[PDB]
Structures are given as C-alpha cells and as structure tokens.
Design a binder for these strands. Structure first.
Ligand SMILES: [K+]
Ligand SMILES: [K+]
Ligand SMILES: [Mg+2]
Ligand SMILES: [Mg+2]
Ligand SMILES: [Mg+2]
Ligand SMILES: [Mg+2]
Ligand SMILES: [Mg+2]
Ligand SMILES: [Mg+2]
Ligand SMILES: [Mg+2]
Ligand SMILES: [Mg+2]
Ligand SMILES: [Mg+2]
Ligand SMILES: [Mg+2]
Ligand SMILES: [Mg+2]
Ligand SMILES: [Mg+2]
Ligand SMILES: [Mg+2]
Ligand SMILES: [Mg+2]
Ligand SMILES: [Mg+2]
Ligand SMILES: [Mg+2]
Ligand SMILES: [Mg+2]
Ligand SMILES: [Mg+2]
Ligand SMILES: [Mg+2]
Ligand SMILES: [Mg+2]
Ligand SMILES: [Mg+2]
Ligand SMILES: [Mg+2]
Ligand SMILES: [Mg+2]
Ligand SMILES: [Mg+2]
Ligand SMILES: [Mg+2]
Ligand SMILES: [Mg+2]
Ligand SMILES: [Mg+2]
Ligand SMILES: [Mg+2]
Ligand SMILES: [Mg+2]
Ligand SMILES: [Mg+2]
Ligand SMILES: [Mg+2]
Ligand SMILES: [Mg+2]
Lengths: 124, 394, 101, 46, 336, 240
RNA sequence: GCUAAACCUAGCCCCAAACCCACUCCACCUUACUACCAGACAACCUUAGCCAAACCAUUUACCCAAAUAAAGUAUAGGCGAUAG
RNA sequence: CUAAGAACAGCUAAAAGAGCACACCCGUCUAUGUAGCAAAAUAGUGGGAAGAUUUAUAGGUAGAGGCGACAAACCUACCGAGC
RNA sequence: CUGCGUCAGAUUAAAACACUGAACUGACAAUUAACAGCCCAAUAUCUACAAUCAACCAACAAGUCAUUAUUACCCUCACUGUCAACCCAACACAGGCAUGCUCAUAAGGAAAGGUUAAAAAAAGUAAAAGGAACUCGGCAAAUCUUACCCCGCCUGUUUACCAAAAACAUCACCUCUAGCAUCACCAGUAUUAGAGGCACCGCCUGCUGGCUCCACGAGGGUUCAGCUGUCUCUUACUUUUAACCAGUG
C-alpha cells in the first residue's frame, strides 16, 4: 500500500531514516563524540560582495541602443586579443624563446594556484 | 594448544596474485588505468599510500616501540580502576607498612568529650541519610551513582559547621578532580600510583605525627607477609610506555599544599562494578601512600631514607552505606629493601552508618511493618568520621 | 550556491568563497501573527541558516541575530484528468529576527 | 482469525527487501531491473 | 501538552516573554534595605575567592588538555561549587542559619503552573477552550535550602507603576515548543524534607550562551537579557514550588510573600537577582480579578576579575564579592 | 545468510564474553541440529584447558592458588578461577576443590612416581597406575579434550615404552604418549546426573526445544529393513 | 422525446531501405537519484519439460549463415512414431 | 529461530510451568449474522493470565524447499506442495 | 503524507441532508529546537563477584550496563523530523493496532429521520400452580450446587476460516549412534551430544509386560439437591426490526 512513485524524502521513514536524509544543503562541519557538531569556518562559503556605490550599470538597458550582432568568445579570439600583441613586440625585438612562455602568461601546471582551471576548485 | 578466534571471523587471505606477475620481463595489463575493478583484467599492486598531512580525525599513532617514552623495564601502574586480588595484604607489601586495627587514640580522643559533638547530632545525620536516599530526586528510589556522593558531601558540610567551636577549620578546602603521581621501587619492581577521582581535603598545615619515635623504630622487627604464588604486581597495569615523574597535583605556590583526607566513592550501580570491602581498603592505602609519598619527595628531595618528620595522610572510603577509615603515616622513603623502618596504617573496617534504608513502607496484609527511613542507624560510625575531620584543628 | 560542486576542504585549506551566488530569496507575509522583529523568507532548499545569515548581512547590510528555518511540504493530493498526482514543489521557510531591536 | 491485513507497512523492511541496493546485489535482481527498464516502468524498485 | 520553559534560553528578548508567563514585573537594582535596628574580614574572604579562582585556572594540573568547549564544565563549574562551599563556612559565624542549612549540587527544580487560555485552531478539538500549561525543568548549579522562610522584600499588597509586558502572538513564536510528560513540582527535594524554603541559587550559564559567542551573533543587547531571563524563570519556579509545598495553589492563593535569591554567572561576569512571589493565581479564572503581581529585582552584569595571568589575578573586584556575602548573610527574622 | 560467528575474540580473558545463540542453524541459516533454541541468556567464560602453560617470563613447574569455584552455564561441570604469578585464568574444577587451595602444574617426569594430588597437573609418565584422571590430551601441546564432563574420570591402565593406556568414561581404551598432561582426580559436580528437571519448563530454560510430534516408525532396527534373500523370501511371512 | 445513436482521424501493421541511441548544470550501487575517508566480495559450468508415439520407459522437427535442385534420396530409428 | 527491548492491578498464598481475578492473549458453548460491521465478526458465557507467557523492532531459513510440541499445520484471505 | 485551517467556486452526492453550502474543486496559508535523529583519532592494554527498595535471607535458569598507558587534538551549535478528524482491512468498515499517563475523567462523545405500536423475527424484563414432566443431551436461562465412572499424569500445544480432543508435547524411564575441535552440534567432550520410543511417580514383571493412585480437564457419560417459561401452556411489557411518510438506493 506504499507509494513507490512518489519522491523519497527525509519526511518519510522512521526516526533513523528521517535524520540521516537531507535536503541538498552542503555540509559545513562534522560530528564529534557526544553528538557535538563542530562547524568549520572555512567550509562555510563566504560571499564576496563588491561595493555598488557609484555604479553606472543598472538592471535594465534602454531601448535606444543599436542591435549589435552576437559574437561568442573563442579561445582563438582571446589569444589574439591578449597574448598575440605581446608576442609581436617581442618577435620584432628578436628576444623570443619557448622557455619564456611562462612570462607571456602561460601556466605549465595548475598546481600551487588559488584558482585552478582543471579541475576547478572554486565555486561559481 | 587451542587458538582463540575461528578462521571464519579472521580476515580472509588475499586472492592469489595473477600469474602474469611471475613472468620476468613482462608488464601486466591491469585495471589501474580504468580506476575501477573489472574481472577480465589483472589485479594491480598498489604501493602504500600516505595522507600527506596531519588530520586529527584520521590520525594513526606510531608503533609502540617508536614512542619516545618507551622503556624495556615495565612499570606497574595502580589507578582508580585497579582491583587488587589479595586486597589489603597485597597493598601492605607494595607500600611497606604495618597494619594496626583501630584508629589512633589521639584522633578518637578529639570527639570523646561531649563539647565537640554537634548539636542534635543524631537527628542531623538521620536527615542527611534520609535526604540522600529518599528526598534527593523525583524518582522514588535513587540509584547509587546519585546518593553515594551526596551522602558524603552533606556529612562533610555537617562537619564543616563546627567552625564556630574550632576557628581552625577555616584553613582547609575540598578539592575535586585532583590527581597525583608517585614512583618507587619494591625489590627491583618499578611501581607507580596515579590517583584520581573523589574529594581531596587540603590544609595549609601538615597533619601532626601520630606514632612516637620509639613506636616507629619498633617496625624493624615486623616482617611483611607474603602471598605466594600470587605475585605482588598482579591486577596492575603493566605498561612499557610511561614517564617516571613525581606530581603532587598542584604547582608551587598553592595555598593548601598538604593533603588532609582523601574521600573515595564507589558510585557504581552494578555490584560487580563496585569494589569489595577488602579491595576498597587496598585502594585507600595505595592512594594514601601515593599522596604522602609525593609530599615527602617534594619536601625532602628524591632521595631514599627515613624521614625526620613523618607525614600523616588520612583517608575515608565509603560505599554509601559502609564506611572505611584509614590513617596512613609515611615513616620512610627507602622501600627497595624489606628491612628497616616501615610505615604505619590505622584502619577501621566495615563501619555501618545504617543497616538498611526503606524508600517505601513495607505493607504486609494491610499492615505497615517497616516505615520509611533508615534501619539500624549507628551514631558511633559518624563519630569516627567527625574525629578524622577534626584532626589537626582541635 | 546551488547545483554546483563545492571544492573539498581539508585541514589548513583556503577559505571557501563564492563570488556569484544563484540563491534567490523572496520576502513573504506570514499567515499567522508574528513578533515585530521576526521576518519571514522563502529560501531554496540548498540554503542553510548560516548562508542566509551571511546572505542578508553581506548583500542587504541587514544585521541578523537569530535565523530559524523549516521545510514546508507541498501537497501531492491534486490529480489531473489522467488521475496522475500533481506535486506542489516543497519550499523552505526561514524566520529571521532583527538584531538591534 | 480475520484476514486481509497481511500488509503491515514498515519503511525499513520495504527498502531492505525491494530496494535498489537489494536488487543490484545479485545478478538475478539486476535482470529484474533490466526487464522493467525494457518494459518502461515508471518505478524500477522501491 | 505543555510548553517547555527553559531558564537558560537562546531566544531573543526572552526576559520580556517570561514576564508575561509568570506575571512578574522587573525592577532595576536590588530591593530597598530594611531600616531595622562581630567583625567581617573582607581580606580573608578576598584571599579565599582568589585561591579558589586560581586553583582551577592555574594551580590544578590537568592530566589531559582542556578544550574550549570543556572550559565551562571543567574550569567554571568546579570554581562555582568550591567558592560557595568555602563561603558558607566562612560566613557561618556571621550567619547561624547557614549551619543548619541544606546545600545542593546540581539538583533539579521543577514547577508546573497554568496561565492563559487558547482556542484550538485545528483538529477534532477545534473551537474548544484549552488552558496553556507551562513546565520549568531547571537544574541550578548550587542552591541553599533553609528550614525558615526569609523576610519579605516588599509588602504583599505593594504595587509598582509598571505594566507587565503582554505578547500579541502565541507563545510558539518565542520559539517555545510543546511536549507532554510527567508534571513535577520540585523545590530540589521531596515534601518530607524539612528544608523546604529556598535561600539562594547559583547558576552557571552554558557555553552556548557565552558572552563571546553572542557578540559574533550580533546579540550584544541580548547579553543582559540572558541573565534576567534565567533569573525570572528559575526564581519563579523556585518560589512557586515552595508555595506549593506549603499547600498554596491557584485557588488557595498565597497569604505571605515567598522570596528567593539568585546569582547568575558565566565564570567571570556576575549578576544578582531577587524575586518575590506575591501571587500564585495565574489561571484566567483566578487572574481575572487578581490585582497583585510578582516582583523581580535585578543588577547589571559585572566582572569579578579582569584577567588571570599565571598565579596573579588582575583587577579583582570586592564589590562583586561583597554582594555575594550580603546574599548569604541574609537570614530569616527571629521571633521574640 | 549474513551469519558471523561470535567466536571472534583472539585474546584470552577471564571476563565473561557475551555469546549469541544459534538455534540449531548453521552459517547458511537452515536448521542443522533440531531441538535447540531459546533459553536463558548466558555469557561464555573462556577456559584454559592447557593446564601447563607457563608465563612468558617464567618456565618449568609453577603453582596456582584457587580463588573461587563457581557455576558455568556452558558446561555441565563447575569451573575454578586460579591465579598463578601475575595472571588469572579459568580451569575445570575437580570434585574436591575449594577457595584457597594450591594446585601444582609441572611437566617433569621423574624416575619414580610421585604422590598424586587431586587438581594437580602432571604428565602421564609420572602418575601412578590406576589413579583417576581427567581432562586428558591426545599429544603434548594439544590441550584437554576428553573426560571434561562433570564427574567423569579416566583410568591409567598401564604405561609401556613412553605410552599410556587411558580408559575413557565410555569404557574404551585410548593410547597416548606418556608426556601428555592430565589432571588428577574426578571432575566437579559428581551428582550432576542425579538432578531432576521437574517440569517441561526447565528444559526450555536450558535452550532445549520439544521433540518433533511425528510418530517415526523408523529406528535403529525398525526403520532399516534386512533384504530377504530369494531362498529366504518364501519364508518371510506365513498366514495364520 | 429522453437515454442515446451516428462520424475520421489519432495512430498502427507488414515490407523495402539503411547497421541505432545515450556528456546543459546538479544528484544517482548507502535506505539509488544521498557533496566529502584503509577496501580487498567478484564474472564463465549439457537446459528441462510439456507434447507425439493414441500409456510409457529409448526416441520426438526447432534459422546457423546461397534461393533452387539433388531429396524427403542415401542414412538414422522401442528399424515404431518419426528424424534426415 | 537470532539480536537487543517491553508488559503483567488487586487478593489469598508462597520463594509454586500455585488459586481467585483486571489489562492482555486465546476462542469452549449458545445466539445473532450468512453479498454480514466482518472473504470468520458481534453479544453473553468461558480457558490462561510470573510463564513451555504475551508482545513491539530488526535479521535469518524459499518451493526437488523452508518450518513444524505431526494438524499432511503453516510458508501474503483456493498449499497433498506458494506465486 | 496536507487528508473538516482561510477564501472563492458554472460548484454540488459524502451511501440522508445542506444556502454559511462541505470530509468536493481551485487558490492561499502552514509544522520555527531546547525534544528526537544524525555521534566518537590511533595502537595496545584492561573488564571473576547478577537482578529483585539490595540491606536481611534464599536461590538458579547464572544474568541488562566499568578502563588504563602513550600519541594526536583546544575549531564550535549545522543538517533533518515537527500539520490533521491520520494507520492495516477494496469503504468515513461493530475488526486489527506497541508503549507512557488518566482508572473515571479536568478529556472525548450521541443509541432515536418522523410516525404508528399488526404479524413474524432478535434482545431483555416479569409470571399463578407445578419444578426437567422439555430435550439426542438440564442446550439456553435461573441458581451458586453433591457424588462418581471412562480417557488423558499434570501446566502447555494443534487443524488461522466447521474438529481444542482421548490427539501431540511433557518431566521420568528406555533404546540407538558417536572417542572428537576453529562457521551448526561447540568455542562443547560419554554425568556429553544426536536420533528415537514411551508418557511422571509407586507397585509388579522379563532377563519387556500388567495394575494402582495424587491432584488436574471449556474431554465423554451418570447423579443428589436446588434452580428456573425448558416444558404442562403460554402470557404481558420494553427495545431493535417491522409497517407508513420523506431522502438515498
Ligand atoms: K498421457
Ligand atoms: K479438557
Ligand atoms: Mg503500490
Ligand atoms: Mg528544524
Ligand atoms: Mg489485500
Ligand atoms: Mg506483526
Ligand atoms: Mg525425547
Ligand atoms: Mg512421539
Ligand atoms: Mg503420449
Ligand atoms: Mg495416464
Ligand atoms: Mg498460575
Ligand atoms: Mg488462573
Ligand atoms: Mg508451535
Ligand atoms: Mg496424525
Ligand atoms: Mg490424515
Ligand atoms: Mg496463499
Ligand atoms: Mg537535542
Ligand atoms: Mg467533554
Ligand atoms: Mg423510534
Ligand atoms: Mg427509523
Ligand atoms: Mg412460574
Ligand atoms: Mg425426559
Ligand atoms: Mg449452561
Ligand atoms: Mg492433558
Ligand atoms: Mg501433579
Ligand atoms: Mg490445559
Ligand atoms: Mg478450525
Ligand atoms: Mg490457533
Ligand atoms: Mg472450535
Ligand atoms: Mg500421547
Ligand atoms: Mg438420562
Ligand atoms: Mg433434579
Ligand atoms: Mg401475562
Ligand atoms: Mg422510502
């Protein structure tokens, strides 16, 4: 007589079932002896809210604007806008070598970085 | 012989290695690259793994021999949970002391006159017993882990009301959660006592000596009784990872350095978890010896000789209904040999404060046979408790 | 944030920081009489009271003293023309008390 | 005596007997899920 | 079903709520001294106060490391028990009543009372009159019970020009939770105990309600609330239970005031409170025409010491120490 | 079935270890022995059946003092707690054993026999012929397995060429080496077989369930049928 | 004249042809759809029987890779039923 | 069957698979009912009710079988062999 | 798992009703943690002495609760359960349903839709004189009652849904098998274990068989006395049913 086609949630089951099931919220600590919960400050996501005083942009855009075509950003486009200008100046000067690619901005490895790209270790 | 642990409950033998590993110059093809198990590929051999950082929740201690405080010679530790097999007879040999039945005359003479007795003393003790076992909590019959400590704190509080007659009781306090350490040798046996739990009555003045000089010198003719084949270190925690260190429990500068009395409580609901009357007195003697030995070493250094001013430490051990009294005097700190000066210990055994307590009336055939209250109350037992508390202040 | 993978934390690790959050709360009028300082919000299930405490202080600069949350069950009794149960989504109700009176 | 009430609901028993973990424990129960996946069952287990 | 009233509570403005539950008006300061017709050594009391204080922090050697969450239950708790035990012995010459007094360590105090009415909103009992029942299960760290009753602070008919706060919503919004269990009226001992009158209570706030944590939770103005919310609930439950032991209840209201004292501390800061139970009739049937109300006096929290460094106490306060002595020196009036 | 034996402890101790009943069920979960189930809960007390087990720091003959002789639920006989040196262990008590008695455990075989005392453990090569023995072992280092039950006692019939003949309680002879350690005297609870159960309820207290109600015509002789030979097949039954 | 009665699509069937699908974020072998800790558990093994032989007991057809033909032929088989 | 729990007033009696007798368990007799309140119930009268008792929870034994104080009983309201 | 809270609805069948109609539809609202759940660094090492007011005493069925040494560690209150007139029986079903309190309530409820007062049927009450003459049978009812026989020692167990027994089990007795260990038997060892017969005990017997007997029984018969509408011989009244009116069907 049980409903097998309804979502199984923490509101169903005995006491042991109800307390063990959650709602999707991430854990921010661990349980120690004596059923005492220790909250870790670093596990709590801290919001980086910027100062919005004197900010020009607003939630909406005025209709009196041109209908510019959409140009998705690509890796080739970003390389030309950022890294290519520096290489051209160094290429003309004649001081260019693959050993110095780290100076242009290339990262041989992601280890030792606060924000690794793959696998990423930062939230949205 | 018969081994303990059936082979089914033990960890099963790991499966035999695949025969690809037995062929030299041949690299096996395993599922280590797939990061999951498959049956049609060889089982990889994983090298041992280290976490790489210290995690308190998942810490593993180094092997025992790698511990810094590791000694080949074992040290036998006596604590609150040790239950000696021979009781007092085993405790007397470890502490090198002579047993004397009955409390000293000087201690008992303090409460011999009616002038030092408490006003309405008999009624006050009955109300302390009645409150502890009947009126203490909401439940009709409180457990022993509840009235055993309370019945002792109230008696101390009852004896602490005599400051009006004796202004010398204002120089003492009751310390809880106090510990001490004491290390010595008994025939090439390194022994250590780590007392904890109970109440430690501290005083600003040391207790006066009980036995005279001639009585102490008469202990050389006494010989310690043996209990072969049972070893003196039986039922002791034989530990190879220890630290020989003397500790009075307090740092230098404590206003109440001299211990007066140790109160020991067997507050356990289960009878097997409670020390026997013979074993409880054994715990008292070792703790009284351990507390007195730390004072002797702190004041007279870490030598081994006959003390010029012997230290007297009292102890009262109770089960909540049965009381044991001990007066231990430390006469020497050279315990390696069995000859010479030996310590003295006055012990009173099996002192009943009350024979039985009825928390409910006994109604048989609609007749109240036994009313609520203590049965067989002995006021003489509390006099001994009062005499020990009044020692050093009268 | 919700529907994202939180980077794992170990002892000595960096502070977990979120720069863009997808949590959207909505202030609602309580259906029952409430204390004056009490404020009621509807928050996503993934949101905790610790996150909501920093959410209001960090974004709206609202000092908060106590946050209490509960999960509200959505009725599954409604059925359509096919006799198939229609589920009202469950939402979490948060009760926020102002700090300085 | 009176019959018809043989079913006494219990979530612990229901999940342990007909659960997803219980089905996949044995190769025979995996085919039970495979048949229901082939048939198109809305619920493959409890 | 009855509301579980917790004296040491994390609820905001719980003092204002508990005044309505107990019909108590809170007054600043202490009761006025009675203008009515030995040598007290302050130095001896000051030394013992520091010796007991320094014993737990510095002198006593811990076998294992004491953690932050264990400070209340390993350092603060033994200090409170030991300080009271020594003070009652040092004040016995100055107050004979303390000698024949019962001192308790962490004994439960229960009081069950009925105040208010509600109309059940839902269920088969909807629309029916059901009384609001309350239960206080308080376990003070220390308390002193005496055979005689202390003198009243103000007369029974005395009234103040202060209105008792009234809640506009249901008690569930405190938050307060209902639970059905055994109803107890307990002063700390059974009715057979001769020492059925209370003298002074000693409370230790839990580390969850510590001053430092409330500052992180923007509860700076709630620091004083926790002290007087515990006092109002604990003392009303204590005085109310004492009145019940004397045969008084809602219909047979008390004929004489019942008073008690309380000292609320977190280990460092101390607060002192005095309570008088003028009325025990709180049911809507009996409180409709009841003119009198219970009175509670309170002091601001003050630190006993500023900082403990090694074996020296910095900024020790004798005013806080003397206030503890005056509470203990209070004795019932003697007959002719 | 997810059956795990409770016999997982690997370190000897005198502490009573909690054991779980089987009900006649094997590891598969099906009944393998009938009539077993229920009864009062019992805690198993580990018994050291190797009487001569010198300590780690000691060797040779040693002595033990009996502390207490008590009741053991697991076995018919009583057990005794003995202390030798710095250890305590459970052994099977003899008929005449009290608290305070001293027992001797040795592996020495002298040229002549020695005065055998009840409860002492000596090798079979140093015991007089005919002395009652119990808790014998097949080979040295094997441990006592035979003559364990209450009141049981063996007989040292003869000793020849380093081997001895042991008469088991079932009146069967057994040949073992003379270096096997045995206990002198009978086992405790001699009048154990003289007990009266009294009621069917007491058998359910011991963990024994009632026998099956089926009338089994099968038996040792009734169930097994001798096949008549063709010559004798004619005379099997004659009408009367 | 009420209840009703009528309707033409939705889609489907059989062929031909050609070898099909499954990463938006999040969760999913633990009690699936559950962020986050020492495992070592691992897969493979003739189908049988109904039915026919008027019972049944040997036996009794089941695509194995080219339609047709050789040919229901050589063979097999309680030399029976039938198989081939 | 296993694990770890719970329950049994009062009275007579005695350290009782004792007696009376509630809760509780069972279902002796009679009557009602027979598409019924009920695919086995109701009312009264009865047996047991400190024990081989009753009972909640989780686990185990599965059909060539299980389990059974043998009634060819029971194994999810057709078990001489479940669906 | 939102299933008599609010509001609205062309609304309108919950086995009658219904405008506020509402246990229907739609929308809105809600149950806030202190209770409960979710626990614990490693390695060794410890844990003979029940419970029952635990003190007497008396047991067997032998039991439901304990650490230390060293190393590591001083960050803090998150998450989930919280409603109701509710669950299992196809139903708003006289059934089934664990524990704590209340032991007659301080809580929770309504047997009669209206009428009439035929038969028959059900339940209950009363009855002259007689008191089992009724009947397969003192079944039912009334009363509060004696003496046996048969069978089974007894408590207990069984055909859930026609058989509760004389059947099974049962101490006690008896037969048969087995000389031993690391998953049942068993962490046991012939005073043990298993497979069986019989059904205690006591007496008698062979070298296994027959009687006696204590209590006990919703077993099967018999009987004294009483009791009574069981009957001679039925009658009166009340309730349900009944019949009529209205709704549903
Ligand atoms: K046929
Ligand atoms: K019968
Ligand atoms: Mg279903
Ligand atoms: Mg919550
Ligand atoms: Mg069904
Ligand atoms: Mg059930
Ligand atoms: Mg048998
Ligand atoms: Mg039989
Ligand atoms: Mg055929
Ligand atoms: Mg046929
Ligand atoms: Mg009985
Ligand atoms: Mg009875
Ligand atoms: Mg049965
Ligand atoms: Mg039969
Ligand atoms: Mg038959
Ligand atoms: Mg069936
Ligand atoms: Mg909690
Ligand atoms: Mg009512
Ligand atoms: Mg009528
Ligand atoms: Mg009618
Ligand atoms: Mg008549
Ligand atoms: Mg007749
Ligand atoms: Mg009858
Ligand atoms: Mg019978
Ligand atoms: Mg009998
Ligand atoms: Mg019977
Ligand atoms: Mg039947
Ligand atoms: Mg039955
Ligand atoms: Mg029947
Ligand atoms: Mg029979
Ligand atoms: Mg007749
Ligand atoms: Mg007659
Ligand atoms: Mg008539
Ligand atoms: Mg009609």
């Amino acid at each position: 007589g049980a409903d097998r086609m309804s979502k199984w949630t923490s509101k169903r089951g005995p006491r042991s079932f109800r307390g063990r099931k959650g709602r999707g919220a991430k854990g921010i600590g661990f349980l120690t002896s004596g059923w005492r919960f220790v909250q870790i400050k670093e596990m709590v996501p801290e919001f980086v809210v910027p100062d919005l005083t004197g900010f020009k942009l607003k939630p909406y855009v005025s209709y009196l604007a041109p209908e510019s075509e959409e140009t998705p950003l690509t890796a080739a486009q970003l390389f030309s806008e950022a890294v290519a200008p520096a290489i051209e100046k160094d290429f003309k000067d004649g001081t260019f070598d693959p050993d110095n690619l780290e100076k242009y901005g290339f990262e041989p490895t992601q280890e030792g970085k606060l924000f690794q790209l793959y696998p990423r270790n930062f939230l949205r | 012989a018969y081994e303990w642990g059936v082979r089914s409950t033990r960890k099963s033998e790991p499966p035999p290695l695949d025969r690809v590993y037995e062929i030299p110059g041949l690299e096996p093809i395993t599922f280590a690259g797939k990061m999951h198990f498959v049956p049609w590929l060889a089982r990889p051999i994983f090298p041992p793994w280290d976490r790489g950082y210290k995690d308190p929740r998942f810490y593993r201690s180094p092997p025992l021999h790698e511990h810094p405080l590791y000694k080949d010679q074992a040290c036998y530790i006596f604590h609150h949970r040790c239950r000696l097999l021979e009781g007092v007879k085993q405790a007397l040999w470890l502490t090198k002391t002579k047993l004397i039945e009955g409390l000293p005359e000087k201690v008992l003479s303090l409460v011999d006159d009616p002038r030092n007795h408490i006003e309405n003393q008999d009624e006050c003790v009955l109300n302390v017993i009645s409150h502890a076992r009947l009126w203490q909590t909401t439940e009709e019959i409180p457990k022993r882990e509840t009235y055993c400590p309370v019945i002792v704190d109230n008696l101390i509080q009852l004896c602490k009301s005599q400051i009006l007659k004796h202004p010398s009781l204002a120089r003492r306090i009751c310390v809880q959660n106090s510990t001490f350490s004491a290390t010595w040798n008994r025939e090439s046996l390194l022994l250590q006592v780590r007392g904890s739990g109970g109440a430690r009555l501290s005083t600003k003045d040391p207790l006066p000596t009980i036995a005279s000089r001639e009585e102490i010198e008469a202990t050389k003719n006494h010989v310690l009784e043996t209990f072969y084949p049972i070893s003196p270190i039986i039922d002791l925690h034989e530990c190879n990872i220890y630290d020989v260190k003397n500790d009075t429990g307090f740092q230098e500068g404590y206003p109440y350095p001299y211990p007066h009395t140790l109160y020991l409580l067997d507050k356990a609901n289960l009878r097997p978890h409670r020390l026997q009357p013979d074993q409880l007195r054994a715990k008292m003697i070792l703790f009284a010896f351990g507390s007195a030995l730390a004072q002797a070493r702190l004041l007279y250094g870490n030598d081994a000789k006959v003390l010029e001013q012997p230290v007297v430490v009292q102890s009262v051990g109770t089960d909540g209904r049965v009381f044991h009294f001990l007066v231990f005097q430390l006469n020497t700190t050279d315990l390696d040999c069995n000859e010479g000066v030996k310590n003295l210990a006055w012990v009173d055994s099996d002192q009943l404060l009350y024979q039985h307590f009825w928390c409910l009336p006994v109604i048989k055939k609609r007749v109240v046979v036994e009313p609520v209250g203590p049965v067989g109350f002995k006021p003489e037992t509390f006099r001994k408790f009062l005499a020990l508390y009044l020692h050093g202040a009268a | 944030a919700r529907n994202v993978v939180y980077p794992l934390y170990r002892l000595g690790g960096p502070q977990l920081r979120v720069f863009r959050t997808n949590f959207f709360i909505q202030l609602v009028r309580p259906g029952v009489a409430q204390p004056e300082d009490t404020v009621q919000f509807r928050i996503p299930m993934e949101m905790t009271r610790v996150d909501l405490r920093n959410y209001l202080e960090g974004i709206y600069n609202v000092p908060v003293a106590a946050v209490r949350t509960r999960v509200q069950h959505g009725s599954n009794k409604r059925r359509d023309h096919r006799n198939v149960r229609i589920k009202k989504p469950d939402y979490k109700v948060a009760y926020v008390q102002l700090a300085h009176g | 005596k009176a019959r018809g009430n043989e079913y006494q609901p219990s979530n612990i028993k229901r999940k342990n007997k007909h659960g997803w973990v219980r089905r996949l424990s044995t190769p025979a129960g995996v085919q039970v899920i495979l048949r229901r996946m082939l048939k198109g069952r809305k619920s493959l287990s409890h | 079903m009855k509301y579980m009233v917790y004296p040491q509570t994390f609820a905001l403005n719980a003092d204002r709520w508990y005044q309505y539950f107990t019909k108590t008006v809170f007054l600043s300061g202490l009761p006025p001294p009675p203008a009515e017709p030995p040598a007290l050594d302050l130095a001896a009391l000051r030394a013992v106060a520091c010796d007991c204080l320094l014993q737990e922090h510095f002198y006593l050697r811990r076998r294992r490391r004491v953690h932050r969450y264990e400070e209340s239950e390993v350092i603060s708790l033994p200090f409170l028990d030991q300080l009271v035990s020594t003070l009652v012995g040092l004040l016995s010459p100055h107050n004979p009543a303390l000698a024949a007094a019962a001192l308790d360590y962490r004994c439960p105090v229960h009081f069950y009372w009925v105040r208010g009415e509600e109309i059940i909103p839902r269920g088969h009992r909807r629309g029916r009159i059901d009384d609001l029942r309350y239960q206080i299960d308080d376990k003070p760290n220390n308390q002193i019970r005496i055979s005689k009753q202390l003198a009243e602070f103000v007369p029974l008919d005395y009234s103040v020009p202060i209105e008792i706060p009234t809640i506009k919503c249901k008690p569930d919004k405190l938050p307060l939770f209902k639970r059905q269990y055994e109803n107890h009226i307990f002063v700390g001992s059974k009715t057979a105990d001769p020492c059925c009158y209370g003298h002074t209570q000693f409370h230790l706030l839990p580390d969850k309600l510590r001053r430092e944590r409330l500052l992180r939770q923007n509860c700076a103005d709630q620091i004083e609330v926790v002290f007087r919310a515990n006092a109002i609930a604990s003392l009303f439950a204590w005085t109310g239970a004492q009145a019940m032991y004397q045969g008084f209840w809602s219909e047979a209201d008390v004929t004489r005031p019942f008073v008690s004292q309380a000292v609320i501390t977190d280990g460092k800061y101390f607060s002192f409170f005095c309570y008088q139970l003028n009325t025990l009739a709180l049911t809507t049937q009996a409180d409709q025409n009841n003119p009198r109300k219970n009175i509670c006096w309170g002091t601001q929290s003050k630190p006993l010491y500023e900082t403990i460094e090694d074996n020296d106490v910095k900024g020790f306060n004798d005013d806080v120490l003397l206030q503890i002595v005056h509470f203990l020196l209070n004795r019932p009036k003697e007959e002719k | 079935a997810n059956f795990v034996s409770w016999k997982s402890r690997t370190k000897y101790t005198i502490t009573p270890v909690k054991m779980r009943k089987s009900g006649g069920r094997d590891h598969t979960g099906r009944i393998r022995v009938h009539g077993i189930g229920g009864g009062h809960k019992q805690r198993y007390r580990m018994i050291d059946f190797l009487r001569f087990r010198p300590e780690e720091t000691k060797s040779g003959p040693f002595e033990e003092k009996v502390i207490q002789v008590r009741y053991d639920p697991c076995r018919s006989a009583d057990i005794a707690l003995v202390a030798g040196g710095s250890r305590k262990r459970w052994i099977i008590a003899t008929e005449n054993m009290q608290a305070g008695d001293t027992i001797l455990n040795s592996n020495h075989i002298g040229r002549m026999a020695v005065a055998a005392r009840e409860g002492d453990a000596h090798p079979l090569g140093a015991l007089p012929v005919g002395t009652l023995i119990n808790n014998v072992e097949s080979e040295p280092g094997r441990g006592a397995q035979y003559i364990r039950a209450a009141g049981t006692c063996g007989v040292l019939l003869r000793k020849v060429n380093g081997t001895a003949i042991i008469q088991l309680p079932s009146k069967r002879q057994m040949q073992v080496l003379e270096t096997c350690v045995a206990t002198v005297g009978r086992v405790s609870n001699v009048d154990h077989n003289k007990r009266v159960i009294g009621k069917a309820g007491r058998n359910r207290w011991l963990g024994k369930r009632p026998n099956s109600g089926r009338w089994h015509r099968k038996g040792g002789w009734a169930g097994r049928k001798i096949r008549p030979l063709p010559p004798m097949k004619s005379y099997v039954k004659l009408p009367s």
